[PDB]
């Protein structure tokens, strides 16, 4: 995240950190995700697309730091990895970029509620906030496009949703953005999501609840003028989500 503040998981208790193992000894970070229900985490298919081996991923809940342990964290293996059939990538955009990971702990259970682990609410069918709404995004992604390392502390920032009309302007993204995507930017192009934040949540308040309105998906550069970050519009995937959850 460019800009933002450093935070702790108590502030984003539904954020999930997904790592990949290289038995060479290291486990590296892959993407973020959100806990929908005790056994299901939702992320982005593009995070897995290249190495769809569920057995090598580890999911942690209740984690405030990237490579050091947080007291209260839970570790899970991925029992099912559901990528979106029809996912497609082009020169920028990812289409149908949503994935579901069913988690199981070594004891055979799903997540348990604590002060650092909570689910986030889903929107109702095709129900979104109106452009202008401020939502927050969280993650362990880069702090600057030139960085080649990810921060160790979890960060968060607030961004505003913009209309499709604004985002589909030719000098923004044109038609690369569809109705199944949402764009969000900082009025001052000062804060934004970046490489490493893919899969994490775009949370807004909808009908009184903190709702998972988008999934961090793509964007040209990070915190660039007229280049908002694009998110998968969760409200348009509700049937898909239910067919599997």
């Amino acid at each position: 995240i460019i800009g933002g503040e450093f935070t702790t998981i108590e502030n984003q208790p539904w954020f999930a950190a997904i790592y990949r193992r290289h038995r060479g000894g290291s486990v590296t970070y892959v993407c973020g995700g959100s806990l929908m229900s005790p056994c299901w985490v939702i992320s982005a298919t593009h995070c897995f697309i290249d190495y769809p081996k569920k057995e090598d991923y580890i999911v942690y809940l209740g984690r405030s730091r990237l490579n050091s342990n947080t007291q209260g964290e839970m570790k899970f293996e991925v029992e099912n990895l559901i990528l979106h059939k029809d996912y497609s990538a082009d020169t920028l955009a990812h289409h149908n970029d949503i994935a579901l990971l069913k988690i199981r702990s070594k004891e055979g259970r799903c997540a348990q509620p604590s002060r650092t682990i909570q689910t986030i609410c889903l929107p109702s069918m095709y129900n979104d906030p109106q452009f202008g709404t401020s939502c927050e995004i969280t993650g362990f992604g880069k702090e600057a496009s030139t960085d080649y390392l990810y921060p160790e502390q979890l960060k968060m920032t607030v961004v505003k949703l913009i209309s499709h009309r604004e985002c589909q302007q030719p000098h923004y993204y044109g038609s690369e953005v569809t109705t199944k995507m949402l764009c969000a930017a900082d009025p001052q192009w000062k804060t934004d999501s970046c490489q490493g934040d893919s899969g994490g949540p775009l949370v807004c308040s909808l009908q009184g609840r903190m709702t998972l309105t988008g999934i961090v998906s793509w964007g040209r550069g990070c915190a660039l003028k007229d280049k908002p970050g694009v998110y998968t519009r969760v409200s348009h995937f509700l049937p898909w989500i239910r067919s599997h959850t």
Binding site: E10, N11, P13, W14, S37, P38, P113, Q118, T119, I120, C121, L122, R209, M210, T211
Partner: peptide, 9 residues
């Protein structure tokens, strides 16, 4: 005890 989606506190 049980989850309450969206609730931090």
């Amino acid at each position: 005890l049980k989850f309450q989606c969206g609730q931090k506190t």
